[PDB]
């Protein structure tokens, strides 16, 4: 009628927010290598050989690495996978059933382990959006946005303080933590260069370590403190994986205290750092609260090749605000590493519709 | 224009940009068990959406006048202000949810007028 009647659109890039469970996308190497957990291989959905991505132009889209909801499913898939998977001989679950310490005893075979890349695909609809800017502080906007059907080549590693074999930061490092300089939050930084660590004890390089400390110290100064000196301190203290660092070294987990690495004083105004590691047989379980026990290694001196990419560590927290800044190693939460892999995305879905209130008046 | 390639104040060019996109709405032991079930579920969901699309009272695109009166409580649009430009998100989900409420009402009313006239006309 002479009044406004609205139109019906179709095939629109409009969207509606979605809250759901995505699925793993890792090739079914299930049949040939082995199904002994090598990092997604029990029954995981294969990867689309053609990853789709459409860049979004002039879309000032913001992203928070704390409210993803894509993150929510990854740790559930990983815990379920480690359970079906590489098994310790000792399982401990203290529960009040003050509490009753429960125990589950099974076999613990050891195999050569290596993380495999896991893409994350969505069901029909559920558009995923990839932030591709340079200055991304975790809880920040993104000028360069590009939607995707499935995630990129994410190579996650369940690990301690420094993320192993993962993604990279933007041009030096990127301070992506919740708070930048609060003495109450965990610092969430990822590397930009794959720091090769050779473990036989680990022959940690010194020039690359001094360079990563220099790039991070300059970024911390750019984030906080114009004329300030930032010095590094030794370990914070705690469990084995807290003082030392757990990482995939040919399946095993050597434990070198990273206290002989963080003692560099940088100024605003060299063959191998062979740290003492430990043979891993009994450690606290990282899945839940308890302990584990595994099979002895097949090698006395264990060789492995690993590239470490990430920087999550603790801090003193004194004031000591801009006079000097002091940071200590540690951290590497399972909940936070879980958030740290999938940090630039969100899921939205849509049906082909949208309006314009007009006086077009067509029959039906 | 593009798949999210513009940024402006709201209401009309989105009808126009979606008009252009809709004018060119086509863009033109071994091998396999898990992927096929996902394709089947996707086509079942798409076709279920299409039959529900088929039971509607508009059947037209980007310019449609289905029978519910977007009443004066909802109508504030000036005549020439209806078709100018439109991007805007939190505002959009509320706009989009408003789009759907008119949609269900509209198609229910045209289904009601089509059915009402169907019972009453009787068009020899």
């Amino acid at each position, epitope marked *: 009628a002479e009044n406004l009647w609205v139109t019906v659109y179709y095939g629109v890039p409009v969207w509606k927010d979605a809250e759901t469970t995505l699925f793993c996308a890792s090739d079914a190497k299930a049949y040939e290598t082995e199904k002994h957990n090598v990092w997604a291989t029990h029954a995981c959905v294969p990867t689309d050989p053609n990853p789709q991505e459409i860049h979004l132009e002039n879309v000032t889209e913001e992203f928070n690495m704390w409210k993803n909801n894509m993150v929510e499913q990854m740790h559930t898939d990983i815990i379920s996978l480690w359970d079906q998977s590489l098994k310790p001989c000792v399982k401990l679950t203290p529960l009040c059933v003050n509490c009753n310490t429960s125990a589950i005893t099974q076999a613990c075979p050891k195999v050569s382990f290596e993380p495999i890349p896991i893409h994350y695909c969505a069901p029909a609809g559920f558009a995923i959006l990839k932030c591709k800017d340079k200055k991304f502080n975790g809880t920040g906007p993104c000028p360069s946005v590009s939607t995707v059907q499935c995630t990129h080549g994410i190579k996650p590693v369940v690990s301690t303080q420094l993320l192993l074999n993962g993604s990279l930061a933007e041009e030096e490092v990127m301070i992506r933590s919740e708070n930048i300089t*609060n003495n109450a939050k965990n610092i969430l930084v990822q590397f930009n260069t794959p720091v090769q660590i050779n473990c036989t004890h680990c022959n940690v390089s010194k020039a690359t370590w001094n360079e990563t400390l220099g790039k991070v110290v300059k970024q911390l100064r750019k984030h906080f403190g114009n004329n300030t000196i930032i010095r590094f301190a030794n370990s914070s203290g705690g469990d084995l994986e807290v003082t030392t660092h757990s990482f995939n070294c040919g399946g095993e987990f050597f434990y070198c205290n990273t206290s002989g690495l963080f003692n560099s004083t940088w100024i605003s105004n060299n063959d191998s750092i062979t740290l003492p590691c430990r043979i891993k047989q009994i450690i606290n379980m990282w899945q839940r609260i308890g302990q584990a026990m595994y099979a002895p290694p097949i090698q006395g001196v264990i060789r492995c090749v690993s590239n470490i990419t990430g920087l999550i560590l603790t801090r003193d927290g004194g004031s000591t605000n801009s006079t000097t800044e002091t940071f200590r190693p540690g951290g590497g939460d399972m909940r936070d590493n879980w958030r740290s892999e999938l940090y630039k995305y969100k899921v939205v879905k849509i049906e082909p519709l949208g309006v314009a209130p007009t006086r077009c008046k067509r029959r039906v | 224009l593009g798949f999210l390639g513009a940024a402006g104040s709201t209401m009309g060019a989105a009808s126009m940009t979606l008009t252009v996109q809709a004018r060119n709405l086509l863009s033109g032991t071994v091998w396999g068990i898990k992927q096929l079930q996902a394709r089947v579920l996707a086509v079942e969901r798409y076709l279920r959406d299409q039959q529900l699309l088929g039971i509607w009272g508009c059947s037209g695109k980007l310019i449609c006048c289905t029978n519910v009166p977007w009443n004066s409580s909802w109508s504030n649009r000036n005549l020439s202000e209806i078709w100018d430009n439109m991007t805007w998100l939190q505002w959009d989900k509320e706009i989009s949810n408003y789009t759907q409420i008119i949609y269900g009402l509209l198609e229910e009313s045209q289904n009601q007028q089509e059915k009402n006239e169907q019972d009453l006309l009787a068009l020899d």
Partner: antibody
Amino acid sequence: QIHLVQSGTEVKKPGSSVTVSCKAYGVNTFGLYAVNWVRQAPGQSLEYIGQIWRWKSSASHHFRGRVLISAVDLTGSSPPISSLEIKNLTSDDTAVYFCTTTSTYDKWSGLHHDGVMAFSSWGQGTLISVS
Amino acid sequence: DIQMTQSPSTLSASIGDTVRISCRASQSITGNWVAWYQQRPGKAPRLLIYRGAALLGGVPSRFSGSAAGTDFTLTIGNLQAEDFGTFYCQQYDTYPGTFGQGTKVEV
């Protein structure tokens, strides 16, 4: 669990500039929390001056060229401090200033329209008698 | 702009009543992009119901509304002692946003 604090009491000369603050406890950054500045005639209604969305210094056409907004972003040791610059403080500029911190990351529940967002929380209110 | 005019200015009521508070506006707003700011005596204005009638889990369900074209009658049922205040229907739709006239609820 989130409280907003503005500047204190300020009395400026006729034909001067002002610099009031907006501290935001429990707030991360202006990138996620854009602040819309609104003035208030003493005792009367509140007139929206402008905004600093995505670190954008702007104001309304009634306030353009006289009001620009800077919001010094700090987190952790110091809450996000949203400042306000109003030049040429005449006696008619006697007003009660106001800021508003609301999230910009949440983008599908009901908080904002073309910059003018839902004003969830407010500060104390700064009565400034330009004399 | 769009001059909001909250109707009435003053009204008398007891505790446990249902009174509709109109809000004039030259433009209607689809879905009521007008936030009611209850400025209670001794407290700053606050958010009562985002989106006119949407469900907010921080404010009790005693606050409800209705929209009639140019007017927006917030039908607040079960009035209480804290309900005796000056509400403020503020459109956060147009640029800039404007307040209404204000409605005082008294004995």
